[PDB]
Design a protein around this ligand. Sequence first.
Ligand SMILES: CC(=O)Nc1nccc(-c2c(C)nc3ccccn23)n1
Length: 264
Amino acid sequence: MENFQKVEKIGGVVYKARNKLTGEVVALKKITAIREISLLKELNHPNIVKLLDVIHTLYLVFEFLHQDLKKFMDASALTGIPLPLIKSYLFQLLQGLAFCHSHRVLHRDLKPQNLLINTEGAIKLADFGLTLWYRAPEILLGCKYYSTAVDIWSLGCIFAEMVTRRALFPGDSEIDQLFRIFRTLGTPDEVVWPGVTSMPDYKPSFPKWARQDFSKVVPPLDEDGRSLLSQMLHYDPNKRISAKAALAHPFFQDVTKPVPHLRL
Ligand SMILES: CC(=O)Nc1nccc(-c2c(C)nc3ccccn23)n1
């Protein structure tokens, strides 16, 4: 760590830093684990933040990117992110997740704060392999052996927030999170989700709300985009669309790679 000069606090704790002798600016994270971290160094992809070095002496040295998606959404709040720029970001994240998922690795806590962007129009996943708003309902209902579907759920909540400029399900506790999901998509039962009533934290006493129309939940989104969102938010994890199959959805027929307007 004598080889690094802390520039500033970025957001254990994460620091922007300069390799005192090398030229690189980098993002430095101060934290069976050692072996797990060694499997991540080899998990390299254009939509995954690069893990440069693992220093057990345990610090993690990542590639640096200049902005997170949460701050970018706040700066675009007045006018909103142009739809072609929303569509490009979703397409790329789906590529990232498809990659992770084919090597059996989950993210588990996806959110706007850990999604990083550059001037080139690229978007990357961070915290891979290491707020309740983006949490999948199987996690809330006590399933202990949850699947890659938990990430697809989280990415759909994020898709929706970009389009509407509001958080889809902004809960401040586990039961609040759950009841907001229920009020929008209807309380789940054995019809839509087989096995649901025999989950560790399921209660037969849950209120029974009815489902709302998707044209109400994300109005300005066109029909292809609303179709894909409803398959990313299916209650049953085995019905939820996989990353690979979402990439072939007709929503991405006309996809491009626009450049964003970033003020750094
Ligand atoms: C502006 C910015 O956050 N850049 C950046 N580059 C690379 C990595 C990270 C990073 C990593 C590795 N973990 C977290 C957690 C929260 C926010 C950013 N990060 N952050």
